[PDB]
Amino acid sequence: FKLWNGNFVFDSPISKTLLDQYATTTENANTLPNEFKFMRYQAVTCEPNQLAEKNFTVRQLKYLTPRETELMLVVTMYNEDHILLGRTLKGIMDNVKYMVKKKNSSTWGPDAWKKIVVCIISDGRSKINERSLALLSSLGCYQDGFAKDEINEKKVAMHVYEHTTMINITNISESEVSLECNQGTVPIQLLFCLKEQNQKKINSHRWAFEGFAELLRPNIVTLLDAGTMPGKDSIYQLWREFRNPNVGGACGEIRTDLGKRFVKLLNPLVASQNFEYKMSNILDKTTESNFGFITVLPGAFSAYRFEAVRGQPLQKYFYGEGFHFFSSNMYLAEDRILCFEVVTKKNCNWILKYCRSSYASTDVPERVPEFILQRRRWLNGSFFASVYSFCHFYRVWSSGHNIGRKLLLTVEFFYLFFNTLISWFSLSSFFLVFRILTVSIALAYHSAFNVLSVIFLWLYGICTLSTFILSLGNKPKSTEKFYVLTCVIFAVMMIYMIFCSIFMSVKSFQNILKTEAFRDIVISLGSTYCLYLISSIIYLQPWHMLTSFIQYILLSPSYINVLNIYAFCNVHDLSWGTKGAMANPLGKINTTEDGTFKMEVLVSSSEIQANYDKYLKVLNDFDPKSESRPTEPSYDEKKTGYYANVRSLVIIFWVITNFIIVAVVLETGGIADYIAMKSISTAEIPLMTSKASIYFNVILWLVALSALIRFIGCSIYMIVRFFKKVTFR
Amino acid sequence: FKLWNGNFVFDSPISKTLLDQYATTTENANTLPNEFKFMRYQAVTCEPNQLAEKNFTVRQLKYLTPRETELMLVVTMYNEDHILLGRTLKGIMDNVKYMVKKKNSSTWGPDAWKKIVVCIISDGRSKINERSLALLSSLGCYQDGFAKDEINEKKVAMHVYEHTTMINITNISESEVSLECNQGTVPIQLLFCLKEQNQKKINSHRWAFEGFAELLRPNIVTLLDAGTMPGKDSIYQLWREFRNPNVGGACGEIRTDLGKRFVKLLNPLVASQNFEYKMSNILDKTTESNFGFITVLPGAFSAYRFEAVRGQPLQKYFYGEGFHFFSSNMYLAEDRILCFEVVTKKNCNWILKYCRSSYASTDVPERVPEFILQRRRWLNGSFFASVYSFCHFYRVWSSGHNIGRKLLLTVEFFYLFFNTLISWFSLSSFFLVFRILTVSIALAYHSAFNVLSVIFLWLYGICTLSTFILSLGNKPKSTEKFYVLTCVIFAVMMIYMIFCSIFMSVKSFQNILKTEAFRDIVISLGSTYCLYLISSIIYLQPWHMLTSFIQYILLSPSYINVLNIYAFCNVHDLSWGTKGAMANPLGKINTTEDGTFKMEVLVSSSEIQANYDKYLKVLNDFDPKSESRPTEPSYDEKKTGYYANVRSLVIIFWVITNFIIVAVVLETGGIADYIAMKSISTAEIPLMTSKASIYFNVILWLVALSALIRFIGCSIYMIVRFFKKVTFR
Ligand SMILES: CCCCCC/C=C\CCCCCCCC(=O)O[C@H](COC(=O)CCCCCCCCCCCCCCC)COP(=O)(O)OCCN
Ligand SMILES: CCCCCC/C=C\CCCCCCCC(=O)O[C@H](COC(=O)CCCCCCCCCCCCCCC)COP(=O)(O)OCCN
Ligand SMILES: C[C@@H]([C@H](N)C(=O)N[C@H](C(=O)O)[C@H]1O[C@@H](n2ccc(=O)[nH]c2=O)[C@H](O)[C@@H]1O)[C@H](O)c1ccc(O)cn1
Ligand SMILES: C[C@@H]([C@H](N)C(=O)N[C@H](C(=O)O)[C@H]1O[C@@H](n2ccc(=O)[nH]c2=O)[C@H](O)[C@@H]1O)[C@H](O)c1ccc(O)cn1
Ligand SMILES: CCCCCCCCCCCCCC
Ligand SMILES: CCCCCCCCCCCCCC
Ligand SMILES: CCCCCCCCCCCCCC
Ligand SMILES: CCCCCCCCCCCCCC
Ligand SMILES: CCCCCCCCCCCCCC
Ligand SMILES: CCCCCCCCCCCCCC
Ligand SMILES: CCCCCCCCCCCCCC
Ligand SMILES: CCCCCCCCCCCCCC
Ligand SMILES: CCCCCCCCCCCCCC
Ligand SMILES: CCCCCCCCCCCCCC
Ligand SMILES: CCCCCCCCCCCCCC
Ligand SMILES: CCCCCCCCCCCCCC
Ligand SMILES: CCCCCCCCCCCCCC
Ligand SMILES: CCCCCCCCCCCCCC
Ligand SMILES: CCCCCCCCCCCCCC
Ligand SMILES: CCCCCCCCCCCCCC
Ligand SMILES: CCCCCCCCCCCC
Ligand SMILES: CCCCCCCCCCCC
Ligand SMILES: CCCCCCCCCCCC
Ligand SMILES: CCCCCCCCCCCC
Ligand SMILES: CCCCCCCCCCCC
Ligand SMILES: CCCCCCCCCCCC
Ligand SMILES: CCCCCCCCCCCC
Ligand SMILES: CCCCCCCCCCCC
Ligand SMILES: CCCCCCC
Ligand SMILES: CCCCCCC
Ligand SMILES: CCCCCCC
Ligand SMILES: CCCCCCC
Ligand SMILES: CCCCCCC
Ligand SMILES: CCCCCCC
Ligand SMILES: CCCCCCC
Ligand SMILES: CCCCCCC
Ligand SMILES: CCCCCCC
Ligand SMILES: CCCCCCC
Ligand SMILES: CCCCCCC
Ligand SMILES: CCCCCCC
Ligand SMILES: CCCCCCC
Ligand SMILES: CCCCCCC
């Protein structure tokens, strides 16, 4: 044929079956648009930022009247099953169908499907699941055969398939994705585009933001994820938060998919994540949404105003600039740098909201090795984005916000830093609460609490040493049975700690009715748990405070110890130099039956003598003093050596600063020996001092203060939403 | 031309200059043998064990009367300078020249050079230093041009050059290797053979033992390293130990090359290694030689009787057999498995001798990162060979030794295991000696020794934590300035420890003349240092007890802590799975000026419909219950996961067992708290207990007992040698 100005663009038909199905939808089979009968394949052979320059287009811009996209739903996928992708697509099509049935809308209506463009971006053709390709092909958005690797000695970077389908998923069973095309389906503009090389997930967003977003010029860019099924109208509810111009990015609630009839609650790891997510979306997102800066907008379900992110925010997201600390480690916070650069944008008053009435059930890990590896990225990004946000807090005052909002933002950044400092010292805080609570009960009532205080300290020491060693030089999949054992041991430690607290609390009552432990029950059961329960109730979602709350408590020591140790030990995912330099090729010999071969060799006396003199002048012009500089590292081998140095100086600084607090409260590290020796000069060490009780009270009142601030934030969020509801009635 | 039975063999001439030089040597230029005028190049394209089978030969077997090789000197080299190789070659040619001038010999004489075959084996052609190639080419054993990469679609495994040279090195300056050919030179049968691929060092010995040793059938095989210059007659003295049939392997003294006028003694790291080597060859080699089993025969200078190692010992050395502990990890002890399998050989009474009068100065690391990486292999091999030797000690009694020697060997194995147990607990032993000595001086005399006991404990804790973290997840070359700082800090700790010992020793004397510390001076200065001095003196080599003995003491804490921590943290040199699976190739498009290209595409309704149904039956026959088993690891990624599990279970077991002793002597780990709490039940902790003094005395009397056993062994060795000297007068 002929290509489209240096671009391979083939406009092929779909199939007889799909055409018949689509024709059943319309009242007249003759009047079927030109978008449902074809599937335009393009071979993009350039960078995403050069898409418009290299004359690559999409089908939305080639209509007689160009379509103005209002939502660009972006579904990043990689090796996900057809059930995970089908679950995400069913939510999108339910949202589009809901957004078409609306009547009292100035944006949505009978022709609302032309404003949404669904853009599935798979990460590598070699890694995509064949069942996912089968599902996309059954939707009319993928045909086998047109996947050319190279176009005019230019490698193809992406294969872009686009087809406005009429097929909608209507049911996702455990093994079946039901695809009906009746009179009650809506068209979906599919733009499934899969890469050739697996260039991670940030590059998928680079393709969706610097690439197709530039051509589409959408208003909002909702970033879904493969496996994350939004609600019946959650994307529409998330889009409703952009009615006021100030919002330049919003996020919804992400729930946990508990399976058929809540079957996954039996898994203690899934139930713990359920409660953690519910608390994150009741106390963290609601509190941060009041100030106007949400720490992370989840990549699984979030929406950005395109105008808000275009420019400096996306510039630091993708490139972000030597080996400097804030420029070489900025990639740890993948999409958390996109939230800080939008709120703190020069001459722009952007804020981030959290939509309570827009949910999206996701798929969470069910196994410890898969759960630990996920939270390493989460913890590393959250730590590196909090350090970046606090250090660059002066950029709030260089933005276009008013003074009233700037003050709230700088108050929130201090609170976020205080939370970061609490989470940094959690390794020492848990050990000190455990060690003070199990020693102060062995002094008060002795009996078997004596040897139990030594058994559980040694068990802690062994489980923490082994976690440090298995995290620095071993993989979680290598040792799955030990990480589960460590989680079980820390759960036993938490059970013992709770028992000790209840015992010393009931004994204090029976001593008064017939102190550090007297106010220990109005600090962690009445001021902390009751506030969580009330916050969950006022959120109108209290059913997780009993279904999945014990598994969270029993697994919290694993969150503090196993999870943070592994996150801090694998900061940078090192690989070390692996090049394998190759020598210059030499000649070839291919003998015959008798073995005679060509003669092109050197036998001449002069020719041999010249080589001998060449090897004789090398020995004669060595010149040791002017020794050539030893070959210095490359960049990938020099850059790994810096990531290793940053990684190790973080573990050392995090272990030493946590131990300094343990060395001050419990007087370990020779501190007690030194104090006793001074008294000798002017010979015994006390077991428990007065610093231990003061620290215990302080570290359990900080937990109550954080819960109280989070409760106040949640209440303010709910009250403001209720007032915006009573005024829009 | 024509090849030699499927083998590329070219018999080229050398050069006009070399022929003239050789002709100057002979009285008549016409009567020059055929071996000095040619250089037979061969292209070996097979495994070393198939060398004879695939009709590959050497020049000694093609004479009219085949030459019987008596010594096969094997010089393994890899990327070494031309000075390092020239230094090794000068010693070999001095030895050959010494072995020709002998007259009262039934093996050596005017034609003794026909029995020695020097076999240089370089490890990779891409890595060999071009100046080393220049030096070999100037010796007439390498010509550029004949290095074919493949012979009849069969990759060339080695390029074998062989030429009996007449050129001898007579002086090695800092940058010049003097090559004269006068009337006082001896021929050297060179067999320089370099590989194509860098297959490590064990494969070089596989080529030298299963390969050219099979063809040559030598009596002795001396293993040198490029850079190790033997003495004027050290190889002859080493060969002289094989006169008695019992010896099936011998080794000489390895010294340190201190440079021109002992310039390298300024380096404290070189001076420390000097003393360590001196003591190793005065107290370890001499003591072990009496029993008849030397723990390691150094790869830099050792000799094996060919018939002694030929068979089961070499089979274990090279292949040595699942993931079993003694079969998967036995490669850690590279050549230490060759020593144990020779002494404990079925129906063979082989013993290993140590030759005092055969030395070889070597090149030692001058920088901390290079010194740490070398000693990792040494420590790991010595630990894995001691565990193997002790566990398989029953194989001594299944060998052909007599009962008297079997009893001596089983007595030696228990002593070697006791030394291994001491070196395993050195991490705790040093800390306990340091902590007991700096606390017991702060109680006795207070003053500034109080805060110094806490500063130095915290300094130790920081330097040990940082060494553990920098060893598990960082490379020594990445952090060179920190390892030097850690060595300096441990040297300061040793200076303080020595000061504390001297202080408390002089105070005890001034208290008695006007106890754990009273006998502290007759345990570590009179029973340990005096025995070292006397052993060095009776060895007739005492000059290192003063030149390089302070730098050894100041660097011993680094040997105990930095060196062992790094060795135990990097047991297996992991790399983790790095494969990068590739997808199937797709089509190609090459457009023309107008962009028209060939049409071989699918447009047919049936052909598209068949693909659509193919992607519709994949979505229809998912069958989740009969789910395909998840793709299990390969072998290189499954074998790394086992080396990681063995590596981590060694660090955990080595840290926990060392801390148990610290938890028993100092009562840390809640032991003191638990002891005080029992007294509460029937409230203060003592600073120093009576267990600390008992352990201090025990751990400093074990040091004296080991030194006494080593002194007795050295004295017996010297006395036996003196009696063998007075009888052979
Ligand atoms: C020999 C075994 C080696 C094991 C190595 C494990 C891996 C990494 C490095 C660990 C560094 C500490 C090594 C062991 C030191 C030790 O067992 O020493 C003890 C405990 O001392 C304490 O407090 C210990 C407190 C816990 C330390 C946590 C890890 C290190 C964090 C940073 C360290 C900073 C400096 C710490 C200095 C101690 C001194 O007990 P004592 O004689 O005072 O008891 C008097 C009772 N009446
Ligand atoms: C919060 C900081 C975490 C740092 C993590 C560093 C890396 C690896 C794991 C280390 C495990 C130990 C964590 C810290 C425990 C600790 O600081 O706890 C202290 C010291 O306790 C002791 O003895 C400590 C002795 C030294 C421990 C050596 C390393 C571990 C060896 C293997 C484990 C063996 C069992 C260890 C049990 C502790 C309890 O002091 P105390 O309240 O009794 O002092 C009463 C004074 N009147
Ligand atoms: C964890 C997340 C979801 N379960 C998930 O796993 N998301 C992946 C990710 O974000 O890493 C997705 O990234 C894409 N991906 C991955 C690898 C690659 O190499 N290339 C590539 O494109 C895939 O779509 C892949 O599913 C969950 O919803 C969630 C819950 C709470 C929260 O606060 C934030 N998120
Ligand atoms: C350390 C040793 C010597 N300084 C040395 O470094 N020997 C290397 C080694 O044994 O590893 C040699 O091995 C060869 N090699 C190396 C890498 C490779 O990839 N391929 C390859 O062939 C090279 O000849 C290389 O010099 C010293 O003499 C000594 C002192 C005391 C003792 O008890 C034992 N040994
Ligand atoms: C979570 C952040 C903790 C920061 C340190 C808190 C404790 C400070 C010492 C308290 C006891 C002081 C006794 C004199
Ligand atoms: C005086 C009574 C002592 C009773 C000791 C009981 C010990 C029980 C075994 C250890 C249990 C450890 C649970 C983690
Ligand atoms: C005199 C009685 C002393 C008892 C000491 C008990 C020490 C127990 C240490 C912790 C062992 C933990 C095993 C997991
Ligand atoms: C006293 C010994 C304690 C051992 C603790 C567990 C160590 C586990 C290390 C990894 C082994 C392989 C697990 C799959
Ligand atoms: C299929 C793997 C399931 C793993 C579930 C979580 C294991 C750890 C449980 C920790 C709590 C134990 C309480 C007794
Ligand atoms: C003062 C009366 C004490 C009676 C004995 C209490 C023993 C408690 C043991 C708890 C074991 C389970 C811990 C998780
Ligand atoms: C909050 C903790 C920060 C820890 C890292 C600080 C910066 C480290 C930079 C290391 C550079 C090493 C260059 C060789
Ligand atoms: C960063 C280097 C180590 C710093 C250690 C600081 C210890 C401070 C102890 C203060 C006294 C605590 C008991 C009153
Ligand atoms: C180097 C090997 C050491 C093995 C342990 C030695 C010490 C044993 C305890 C000594 C003190 C006992 C006090 C009751
Ligand atoms: C009562 C007198 C106290 C003197 C203290 C001296 C401290 C000197 C600084 C720390 C030196 C550390 C050397 C490693
Ligand atoms: C009452 C005075 C207390 C002094 C405490 C000093 C603690 C020192 C800890 C060690 C610091 C080491 C720095 C390298
Ligand atoms: C080249 C070295 C880079 C940094 C590696 C980590 C060294 C950490 C040493 C201790 C720092 C101070 C802790 C208080
Ligand atoms: C070129 C590098 C030389 C390194 C020499 C050794 C450094 C460590 C010395 C330890 C002893 C210091 C005594 C004060
Ligand atoms: C009993 C008199 C004591 C006088 C003060 C002694 C101080 C010693 C300090 C040593 C510093 C250097 C250690 C390496
Ligand atoms: C002397 C110390 C020996 C430590 C290692 C013991 C054997 C460990 C085997 C681990 C196998 C793990 C299989 C998953
Ligand atoms: C391997 C698991 C831990 C074992 C700890 C053993 C501790 C034994 C202590 C014995 C009492 C010491 C003071 C008298
Ligand atoms: C020289 C390159 C920038 C270095 C910035 C260091 C920031 C350290 C922050 C520490 C926070 C506790
Ligand atoms: C951020 C939380 C750090 C750890 C606080 C203590 C956790 C355990 C509390 C147990 C109370 C009985
Ligand atoms: C005086 C009797 C006190 C009994 C306390 C029982 C505490 C049980 C805690 C269970 C936590 C899961
Ligand atoms: C990052 C610093 C952590 C330690 C802070 C100081 C702890 C000691 C305070 C002593 C007060 C008497
Ligand atoms: C099952 C394969 C062989 C396992 C041999 C284990 C030997 C352990 C030795 C431990 C010495 C302390
Ligand atoms: C094998 C040696 C282990 C450590 C023994 C103690 C070393 C320091 C001795 C200091 C004496 C003053
Ligand atoms: C009473 C005075 C004692 C002085 C002790 C000095 C010890 C110096 C040791 C130096 C070791 C390198
Ligand atoms: C490998 C085992 C190391 C510890 C040996 C026992 C230590 C405690 C002995 C207690 C005697 C009272
Ligand atoms: C469904 C998996 C249940 C695991 C329970 C572990 C305690
Ligand atoms: C309207 C903004 C309210 C902020 C409340 C912060 C607690
Ligand atoms: C930019 C690095 C320093 C930040 C200081 C913030 C107060
Ligand atoms: C212009 C920067 C003002 C910072 C105020 C911090 C409270
Ligand atoms: C623009 C919103 C202002 C909120 C109140 C600030 C004090
Ligand atoms: C009273 C001592 C009991 C020891 C129990 C060890 C598990
Ligand atoms: C999934 C691995 C289970 C191990 C259980 C250890 C208690
Ligand atoms: C020749 C190198 C001397 C280094 C001295 C370091 C203390
Ligand atoms: C003749 C064998 C002597 C052995 C002595 C061992 C100490
Ligand atoms: C072969 C593994 C066990 C050895 C026991 C030696 C006593
Ligand atoms: C046949 C094995 C005998 C062992 C004796 C050990 C002393
Ligand atoms: C064969 C040498 C024997 C030495 C004496 C053994 C007791
Ligand atoms: C008397 C306290 C001195 C502290 C010195 C810290 C280095
Ligand atoms: C070779 C690096 C020297 C660092 C010195 C630190 C004291």
Cβ pair B437, B457 in contact under 8 A: no
* Single-letter code of the amino acid located at A92: I
Q: Which residue of A has its CA nearest to B465?
A: A652
- Residue A660 alpha carbon, nearest atom of ligand 24: 4
Mutate to test the interface with B, among A150, A462, A566, A589 (most CBs of B within 10 A): A589
Q: Which residues have CB under 6 Å of ligand 33? A: A 402, 404-405, 408
Residue A359 parent element (H or E): strand A351-362
CB neighbours of A314 closer than 8 A, spacing ≥ 6? A209, A210, A338
CA distance B166 to B373: 39
CA torsion sign for B379, B385, B387, B389 is negative
Distance (angstroms) between ligand 12 centre and the Cα of A662 equals: 10
* Interchain contact, A569 vs B462, CB within 8 Å: no
Which chain A residues are Cβ-neighbours of B609 within 8 angstroms? 15-17
Helix ranges restricted to H, A167-253: 202-206, 212-216, 234-239
Instruction: Give the closest residue (by CA) to ligand 1 atom 44.
Output: B668
B387, B389, B394, B398 alpha-carbon torsion, rounded to 10°: 160
- Strand partners for B195: B158
CA distance A133 to A125: 10
Distance (angstroms) between ligand 29 centre and the Cα of A491 equals: 14
Which chain A residues are Cβ-neighbours of B603 within 8 angstroms? 12-13
A28, A31, A33, A34 alpha-carbon torsion, rounded to 10°: 120
Which chain A residues are Cβ-neighbours of B686 within 8 angstroms? 683-684
Residue with tokens 């000061």: B499
Closest-CA distance of chain A to residue B567, Å: 14
- Residue B712 alpha carbon, nearest atom of ligand 37: 7
Closest-CA distance of chain A to residue B562, Å: 16
Distance (angstroms) between ligand 28 centre and the Cα of A33 equals: 85
- Residue B198 alpha carbon, nearest atom of ligand 4: 19
Mutate to test the interface with A, among B148, B569, B608, B646 (most CBs of A within 10 A): B608
Which chain A residues are Cβ-neighbours of B647 within 8 angstroms? 473-474
Cβ pair A343, A409 in contact under 8 A: yes
Last residue before each break in chain A (C–N > 2.5 Å): 321, 514, 682
CA distance B695 to B701: 10
Instruction: Give the closest residue (by CA) to ligand 10 atom 11.
Output: A496
State the Cα angle at B89 between B85 and B94, rounded to 5°.
Answer: 155
Which chain B residues are Cβ-neighbours of A674 within 8 angstroms? 450-451, 453-454
Residue A662 parent element (H or E): helix A636-665
Structure tokens of A385?
């984005």
Helix, strand or coil for residue A246?
coil
* CA nearest neighbour of B313 among B249, B377, B252: B249
CA distance A721 to A357: 10
- Residue A488 alpha carbon, nearest atom of ligand 29: 7
Residue A38 parent element (H or E): strand A38-44
Resolution for this PDB entry, in angstroms: 2.9
Closest-CA distance of chain B to residue A520, Å: 23
Q: Which of B649, B656, B660, B666 most suits a substitution to test ligand 20, by most atoms within 8 Å of the C-beta?
A: B660
CA distance A661 to A694: 13
From first CA to last CA, the distance across chain A in angstroms is: 60
Cβ pair A175, B624 in contact under 8 A: yes
CA distance A294 to A724: 20
Q: Is A666 left (phi over 0), alpha (psi -120 to 50) or beta?
A: alpha
- Residue A266 alpha carbon, nearest atom of ligand 29: 1
Running DSSP on this structure, what letter comes out for residue A335?
T
Structure tokens of A219?
């208003």
Residue A465 parent element (H or E): helix A449-472
Half-sphere exposure of residue B725: CA atoms within 13 angstroms, side-chain side: 8
* Interchain contact, B648 vs A685, CB within 8 Å: no
Cβ pair A665, A583 in contact under 8 A: no
Closest-CA distance of chain A to residue B457, Å: 7
Structure tokens of A536?
């969950």
Mutate to test the interface with B, among A10, A15, A367, A671 (most CBs of B within 10 A): A15
Helix, strand or coil for residue B71?
strand
The DSSP code sequence of A432-459 is: HHHHHHHHHHHHHH-TTHHHHHHHHHHH
* Interchain contact, A450 vs B678, CB within 8 Å: yes
Instruction: Give the closest residue (by CA) to ligand 28 atom 12.
Output: B664
Exp. method = cryo-EM
Residue B690 CB burial class (10 angstroms; 0-12, 13-18, ≥19): exposed
Cβ pair A46, A150 in contact under 8 A: no
Of A177, A609, A676, the CB nearest to B17: A609
